[PDB]
Amino acid sequence: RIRITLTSRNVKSLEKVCADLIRGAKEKNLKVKGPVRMPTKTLRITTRKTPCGEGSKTWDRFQMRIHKRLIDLHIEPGVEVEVTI
Amino acid sequence: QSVQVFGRKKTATAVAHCKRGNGLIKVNGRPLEMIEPATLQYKLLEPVLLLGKERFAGVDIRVRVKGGGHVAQVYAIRQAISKSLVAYYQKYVDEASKKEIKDILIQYDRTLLVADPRRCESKKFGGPGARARY
Amino acid sequence: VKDVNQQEFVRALAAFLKKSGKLKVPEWVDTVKLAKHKELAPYDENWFYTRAASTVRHLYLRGGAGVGSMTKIYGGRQSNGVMPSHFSRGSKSVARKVLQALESLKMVDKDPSGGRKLTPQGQRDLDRIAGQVAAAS
Amino acid sequence: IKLFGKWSTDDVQINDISLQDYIAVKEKYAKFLPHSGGRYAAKRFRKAQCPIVERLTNSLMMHGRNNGKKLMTVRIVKHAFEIIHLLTGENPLQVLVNAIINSGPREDSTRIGRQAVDVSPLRRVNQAIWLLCTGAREAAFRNIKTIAECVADELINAAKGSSNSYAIKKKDELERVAKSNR
Amino acid sequence: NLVLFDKATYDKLCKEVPNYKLITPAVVSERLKIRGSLARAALQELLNKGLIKLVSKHRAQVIYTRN
Amino acid sequence: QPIKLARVTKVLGRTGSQGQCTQVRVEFMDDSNRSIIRNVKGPVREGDVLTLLESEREA
RNA sequence: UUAAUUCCGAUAACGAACGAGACUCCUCCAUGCUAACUAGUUACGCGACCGGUCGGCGUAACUUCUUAGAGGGACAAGUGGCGUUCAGCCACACGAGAUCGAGCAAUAACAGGUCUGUGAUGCCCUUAGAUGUCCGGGGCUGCACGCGCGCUACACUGAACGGAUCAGCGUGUCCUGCGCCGACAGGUGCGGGUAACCCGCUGAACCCCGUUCGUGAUAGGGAUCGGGGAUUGCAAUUAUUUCCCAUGAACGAGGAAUUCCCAGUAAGUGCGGGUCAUAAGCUCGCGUUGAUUAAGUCCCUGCCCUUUGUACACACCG
């Protein structure tokens, strides 16, 4: 049993390597568990727009989403892969 | 022979497990008339007082609730119980009895079978809440 | 303990717990207030029996609570004067001494995983009182 | 039979033909509780279909202290109807609808920069509930008399035109101003 | 205002209050000039005897009536 | 003079400095005649019944 | 006519571009797919209690609830009415919805803010008895006062005391669970979690249900001070915070004025993040409870456009 964790910031490139991992391992007659989609994490950073104190209290909100998908069986830039036992 | 229908308030998700048997209606193991807010006790009994106990005397209902507040769970429980009987009368009873139940629950209050999409709005900077400002 | 009103359940269970004169009831039950966010001591003289009846009732519903959980269960709002009010946990020693008192009655034991759970004897005693409140209503 | 639980919704007649359409009581808006939350603040004339027992409940949450506390005001209206039925053997729902009949200003004055103008049938019931709840609220601000007693006395005096109701004194005040400025 | 009943006040409570339409610890406190604490505990005694009934009991609202 | 009871038939427009009074042509219900015009304060729509305390002047 | 130089229409204009819109992220459903021992349900056995309860234990069915991918769904589409029967509006049926909330945001302007955010920077100035730089101590907290954002109140629609019962956002190498000690604040040992795994089923508050309090400057209000216990840190005195006892002030809805706001909105209520060794009366978010009024108008106050006038064009600060 091997659990493959896949974490990326873009779902398109994360599911692209996820489909190729399932399809690439399904042809080897390996019983694999479907892609378990972990709850997405949004890294919130609400900063002050102005570099001084004269702005009209205008804040800018930033987000950095980290999608996590794990594959349990029995790579593009921006995707992290980590296999376990 | 059982269905599992959910009723959703703001954040209160109540799922009723309408299963054949006797007239049992419980929420998280506790009877329906034993929920803590007694002021909203009639809101939970509206599906029973309108449709009559004879329609519920053949199905057990066990509602599981989580999320929202006290009042949100009240409107989510009565909605789950209302739709669980409708979904039961649709898959195991004739469709004529389903319309006989829906027309009674819809004409009284549409919120028993249709959840309202009202949710809390996001707060904007420069104000204490969504609309209000400093 | 369900199928009955939980507010009259803790009042009848405390009467059974007081008539059965075996509870610990520490010496400082007359001086302590049940939380740092409370202004006065409990009005009722037998507050240790009322809290013990309610504490064993929470263990029936959610076992493995412990002292840190009962401190959160019995917490409430803390008035800070001219500052906004916040949530405040209850008393730790009051929650700890009331848990050990239930263990002396063999109604509570240490949970193997977490804190303390309910015993088959305590589950029986709570269901007997739950039957008395149902017949008396 | 549809009731609040003890008080029937039928046999509740409306005297004024104008307010007969803007008062939701009988045979179509009868509910066990004055609390449904039916999104009546959505369109122009949705509040006209809201039951007056719930509008009376919504108007009792008028202060920074009472905002967002409706289950309290439901208990207040629940206890007020107990006192109303106890003081007068008539139906408490009949006393509330009769209170709106007598607490609705028929005419009002507008400022010109006065001039007497008519009052819409919806503004009558809107202002009647506003005047009724304002009188019971000021009557219990500093008094041992509870709110359920003040609401009951505000409604029984308005349903009888006793001229002691805060709504009746304000309703006659707005009319006598329009009578001289017409 | 009055904290403890007197012979002229206690007899006034037991003869005419059970004849009132609305019996409440607030309405009997205003006409008998007694405080709410005494008016509340006094009406509980009349309920035990049987001179008055109980319409609805609550935290801050107790409504009594006549037999 | 009696309190006349009229019924709203047509909503003309908004009058007043801030548009608080609605100009409505309100006819009587006892007979089809007397389709007088009145100024109404509040939300008015076609079909409302007004309680005219004084119905002599048009204004 | 429209939220909109948005459109129709008029038409020496026709056809277009930026902005608006579209678009992006959001919540509202979809018992239809894709899948889940870091999510659960249900059926089962097991076992505690008197067929009901069990977040009390166990691995077979499969996705309602949970998570998140893809694809659907809503477009004034349907009906009636009002309209150059056009652009659109109003009212209804159906329906998860019949104007949802950000982000982005043109041409062009300010002598707007920022050299104290930058190893962005011109010039000037100081350059070793220094305006460099380090280490001590003090200050920015200093108080007859005049204002600006706020919190707490003036209670019975309430304070307390007790019972019961419900969140979501999010953070975590520090967050914290249990067993002991203490009245609290603390302490202590054993632990878990680099996290849908542990904190955590986030047992939040308001609220709800009992219980006493009874126009009362009062069991409203907890400001001002005293005496002690602790925690943070190298060190708190000008009290860092925190706890306990005591002290119990003004304040009975507030003058002329003035602010914000149209639906899950105002307001109440608590939580989390940022700041953070110690840390919220601030702010950025989150859920909870949940309205009154309004579907309108240029009356006021703000800008925009057209017309008009100009000796102005550094443009009336002319």
From Swiss-Prot, chain A:
Disulfide bonds: none annotated. Keywords: Cytoplasm, Ribonucleoprotein, Ribosomal protein. One of its GO terms (molecular function) is structural constituent of ribosome. The keyword Electron transport does not apply. It is found in: Cytoplasm. GO terms for cellular component: cytosolic small ribosomal subunit. The keyword Ribosomal protein applies. One of its GO terms (biological process) is translation. Component of the small ribosomal subunit. The ribosome is a large ribonucleoprotein complex responsible for the synthesis of proteins in the cell. Component of the 40S small ribosomal subunit. Belongs to the universal ribosomal protein uS10 family. This is Small ribosomal subunit protein uS10. The chain holds residues 19 to 116 of 119 of the full protein.
